[PDB]
Amino acid sequence: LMGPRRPSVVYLHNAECTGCSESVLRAFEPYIDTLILDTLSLDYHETIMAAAGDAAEAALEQAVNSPHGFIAVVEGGIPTAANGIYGKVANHTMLDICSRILPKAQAVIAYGTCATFGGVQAAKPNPTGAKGVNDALKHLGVKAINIAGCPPNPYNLVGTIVYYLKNKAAPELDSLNRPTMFFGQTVHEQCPRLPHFDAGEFAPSFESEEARKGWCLYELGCKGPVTMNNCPKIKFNQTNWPVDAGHPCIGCSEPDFWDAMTPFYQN
Amino acid sequence: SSYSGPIVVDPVTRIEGHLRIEVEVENGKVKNAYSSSTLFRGLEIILKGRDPRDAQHFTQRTCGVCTYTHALASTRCVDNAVGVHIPKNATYIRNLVLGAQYLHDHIVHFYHLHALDFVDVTAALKADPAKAAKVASSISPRKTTAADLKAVQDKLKTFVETGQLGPFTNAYFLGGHPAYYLDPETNLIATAHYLEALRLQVKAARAMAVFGAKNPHTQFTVVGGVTCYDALTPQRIAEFEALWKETKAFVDEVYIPDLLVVAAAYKDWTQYGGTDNFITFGEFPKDEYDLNSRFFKPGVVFKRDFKNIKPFDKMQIEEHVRHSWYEGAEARHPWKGQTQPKYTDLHGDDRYSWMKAPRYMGEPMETGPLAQVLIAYSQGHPKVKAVTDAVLAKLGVGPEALFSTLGRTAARGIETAVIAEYVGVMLQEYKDNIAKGDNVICAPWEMPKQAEGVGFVNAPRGGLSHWIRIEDGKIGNFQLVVPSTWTLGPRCDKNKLSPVEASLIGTPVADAKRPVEILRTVHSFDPCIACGVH
Numbered sequence: 001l002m003g004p005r006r007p008s009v010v011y012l013h014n015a016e017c018t019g020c021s022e023s024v025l026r027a028f029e030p031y032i033d034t035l036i037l038d039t040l041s042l043d044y045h046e047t048i049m050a051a052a053g054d055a056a057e058a059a060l061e062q063a064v065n066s067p068h069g070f071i072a073v074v075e076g077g078i079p080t081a082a083n084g085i086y087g088k089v090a091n092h093t094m095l096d097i098c099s100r101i102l103p104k105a106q107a108v109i110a111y112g113t114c115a116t117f118g119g120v121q122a123a124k125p126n127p128t129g130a131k132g133v134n135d136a137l138k139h140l141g142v143k144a145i146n147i148a149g150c151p152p153n154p155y156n157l158v159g160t161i162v163y164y165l166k167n168k169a170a171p172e173l174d175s176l177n178r179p180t181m182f183f184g185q186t187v188h189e190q191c192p193r194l195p196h197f198d199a200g201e202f203a204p205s206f207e208s209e210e211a212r213k214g215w216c217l218y219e220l221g222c223k224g225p226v227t228m229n230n231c232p233k234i235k236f237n238q239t240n241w242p243v244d245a246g247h248p249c250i251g252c253s254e255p256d257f258w259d260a261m262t263p264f265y266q267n
Numbered sequence: 268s269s270y271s272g273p274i275v276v277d278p279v280t281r282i283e284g285h286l287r288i289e290v291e292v293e294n295g296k297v298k299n300a301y302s303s304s305t306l307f308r309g310l311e312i313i314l315k316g317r318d319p320r321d322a323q324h325f326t327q328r329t330c331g332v333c334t335y336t337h338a339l340a341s342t343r344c345v346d347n348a349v350g351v352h353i354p355k356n357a358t359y360i361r362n363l364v365l366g367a368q369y370l371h372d373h374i375v376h377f378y379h380l381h382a383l384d385f386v387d388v389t390a391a392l393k394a395d396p397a398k399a400a401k402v403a404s405s406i407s408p409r410k411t412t413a414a415d416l417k418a419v420q421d422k423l424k425t426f427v428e429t430g431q432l433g434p435f436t437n438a439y440f441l442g443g444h445p446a447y448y449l450d451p452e453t454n455l456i457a458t459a460h461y462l463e464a465l466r467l468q469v470k471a472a473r474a475m476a477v478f479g480a481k482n483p484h485t486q487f488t489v490v491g492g493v494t495c496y497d498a499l500t501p502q503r504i505a506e507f508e509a510l511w512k513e514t515k516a517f518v519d520e521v522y523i524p525d526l527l528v529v530a531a532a533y534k535d536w537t538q539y540g541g542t543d544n545f546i547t548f549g550e551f552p553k554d555e556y557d558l559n560s561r562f563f564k565p566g567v568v569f570k571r572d573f574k575n576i577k578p579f580d581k582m583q584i585e586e587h588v589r590h591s592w593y594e595g596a597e598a599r600h601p602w603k604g605q606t607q608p609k610y611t612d613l614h615g616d617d618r619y620s621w622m623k624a625p626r627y628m629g630e631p632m633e634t635g636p637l638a639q640v641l642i643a644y645s646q647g648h649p650k651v652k653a654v655t656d657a658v659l660a661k662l663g664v665g666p667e668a669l670f671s672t673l674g675r676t677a678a679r680g681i682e683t684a685v686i687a688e689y690v691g692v693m694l695q696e697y698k699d700n701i702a703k704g705d706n707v708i709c710a711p712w713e714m715p716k717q718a719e720g721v722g723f724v725n726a727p728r729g730g731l732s733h734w735i736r737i738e739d740g741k742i743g744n745f746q747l748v749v750p751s752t753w754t755l756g757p758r759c760d761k762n763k764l765s766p767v768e769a770s771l772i773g774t775p776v777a778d779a780k781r782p783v784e785i786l787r788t789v790h791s792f793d794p795c796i797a798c799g800v801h
């Protein structure tokens with residue numbers, strides 16, 4: 001799967017919806033073909049790899065044990081209730097898999113709010129005892145770089161990997177272990193509706209003429225003021241982002257947002 | 268070389284989510300099968316007691332492959348519970364985004380998930396690109412040249428001589444494989460298009476973001492309508508339209524010709540993976556409260572009797588747990604549903620999956636593109652009939668060929684082609700409505716203290732339903748019944764094999780260590796286990 005030349009990436013899927021994997025396929029300049037063929041060696045990824053079953057497990061083993069080292073990118077939370085049985089691959093629990101592989105990586109990136117902070121399956125009452133990677137594996141010394149969002153901007157993943165490959169180190173990280181170069185500003189301070197906010201001009205409903213005219217969505221629940229992400233700047237798919245589509249920010253790059261930010265349509 | 272024994276495929280790759288397939292094979296043929304889903308999240312549990320308006324944001328995270336679909340189903344569900352009739356334009360915009368989702372989804376499935384079961388990408392290195400270019404140009408209005416294809420080969424050559432095969436590591440086709448039939452040239456055309464498809468899908472997904480904020484996980488739906496006033500502007504419509512037109516071109520000139528070439532090379536696959544019963548919910552409404560107002564209409568068929576399509580009765584759906592890791596053995600209608608996990612390990616107490624087993628009038632039902640296509644065909648849908656007949660005619664087979672793995676794969680393409688066209692029709696109706704001076708996209712509504720609602724979506728993998736009971740203005744019960752639940756769930760308390768399990772019986776297996784034939788059938792259903800289990 002790899003050797004010298006391209007750095008090896010092992011991509012793991014835990015308790016996830018595959019939205020994070022899909023976000024990476026939306027990679028733009030560079031595109032995912034450039035990334036898979038020229039930048040990196042994607043040596044394990046269950047969504048797109050050719051091998052299955054035992055052949056897939058052997059590819060993983062091959063990749064993790066390589067003397068050249070590997071970077072791990074992790075999607076999804078780790079179910080820990082009942083000894084991890086709510087999530088298994090190859091009849092091993094996700095907890096066990098991550099416990100064994102992640103301490104061997106040269107670097108670990110937790111990609112998406114599920115892997116960084118626990119995410120949707122960790123929302124109350126958290127029946128599977130889902131945890132973010134760093135929470136789950138604290139005791140083994142794992143310190144993943146957290147790239148949050150549901151899903152994150154793929155610009156942020158590629159940017160982080162490129163930094164690491166250039167500098168052989170993580171970029172500056174905030175107190176939630178997120179790169180400051182992407183998560184240093186609130187959504188709100190970057191938002192085109194901030195003049196309306198400042199003027200106290202709020203849409204009272206989605207049907208209102210105030211909404212039509214692009215007034216601030218705070219009264220309709222917008223979590224922009226309490227959410228750290230680069231959405232208004234980079235946008236998504238090179239063309240839009242939630243508030244420009246008329247909908248409040250739901251706070252999706254923040255820990256426990258499912259419980260902290262709800263009800264989504266209230267402030 | 269006819270193997271007798273078990274085969275286990277875990278993980279099943281090139282699907283969404285965590286699937287374990289177990290088969291018993293006798294003399295090189297599958298004689299028994301189990302579909303085991305090995306991740307549970309419990310979103311239904313998590314939703315209890317929350318604001319019904321919040322449901323779509325949680326349920327959308329059921330799945331990021333069929334992103335948007337669950338947001339749509341939950342919004343339709345709460346719209347229904349609340350009794351709101353959303354504006355015309357909300358219906359148009361929601362339909363357009365959904366049509367875009369189908370194009371994105373099916374294109375990625377065929378190339379990036381299914382094709383490696385049938386294409387030996389390394390054999391593309393042995394190809395003559397001039398001959399390959401001749402072939403490509405003969406199956407498509409799009410002219411492809413030797414140099415075009417040589418560039419792809421060149422790129423692949425560099426990739427393979429680095430010894431870092433990446434996603435192709437340990438592929439079943441490496442070194443050759445008796446069930447892989449394509450010639451080098453065809454492998455090269457497929458490989459080029461795979462690559463091409465990685466960039467084209469960016470545009471297909473962007474089309475959703477034009478109106479829907481972002482992909483994955485759109486953020487433009489609300490109870491009562493949509494939020495995206497910018498979607499009314501000529502600029503955004505123009506942007507959408509140009510992405511749609513390029514996507515449709517790819518569907519028509521790249522995807523379908525490739526599908527046809529491959530089907531023709533694997534015509535023995537008309538002999539395996541058929542199923543008996545079909546269900547579909549219809550999609551793309553004119554009237555949010557009348558399924559029969561949809562471009563594709565709902566319907567139910569038993570034992571392949573398409574001359575007697577039965578009406579879809581939503582009360583005849585029950586989800587079994589006898590062979591699932593939930594408490595007890597009682598099947599439940601989703602308005603009375605229960606999600607009570609109880610793990611027993613594999614085949615403990617005859618339980619082997621985190622998926623429930625939905626049954627309709629007690630029968631296991633296939634849903635997805637083959638159900639949508641066959642039933643629509645049988646309802647006289649003229650677009651579906653035209654495309655279907657043409658496909659059948661090009662492959663030189665009769666309609667009975669559709670009841671198989673090949674048929675299902677073809678049906679996915681047929682549905683893509685029809686929807687790609689119908690998107691243009693909806694787009695025009697949308698434009699027309701705006702030009703009449705209708706600029707409304709959201710309607711007011713009020714939350715009831717007590718109510719029942721259901722929302723229906725025919726998603727790319729089939730009939731999706733979300734079911735709510737509102738109590739005290741909050742979520743008292745919320746149940747998702749998802750296409751892959753129908754198709755890939757386990758046996759029921761009548762021990763009826765599910766569609767995927769039944770379809771596997773009779774599958775030939777040339778090499779038990781590289782059981783591509785099992786993958787071919789499983790992948791033809793386009794499994795999504797996050798969806799199935801939620």
Ligand code: SF4
Binds near residue numbers: 076112328
């Ligand atoms: S962070 Fe969001 S998009 Fe990513 S796996 Fe989790 S639920 Fe899906």
Ligand code: SF4
Binds near residue numbers: 187194197216218248
């Ligand atoms: S719409 Fe949201 S992010 Fe924008 S100014 Fe208002 S509160 Fe801030």
Ligand code: F3S
Binds near residue numbers: 187231242248249252
């Ligand atoms: S919902 Fe998430 S995608 Fe950006 S606008 Fe808010 S952090």
Ligand SMILES: [Mg+2]
Binds near residue numbers: 623746747748800801
């Ligand atoms: Mg369910």
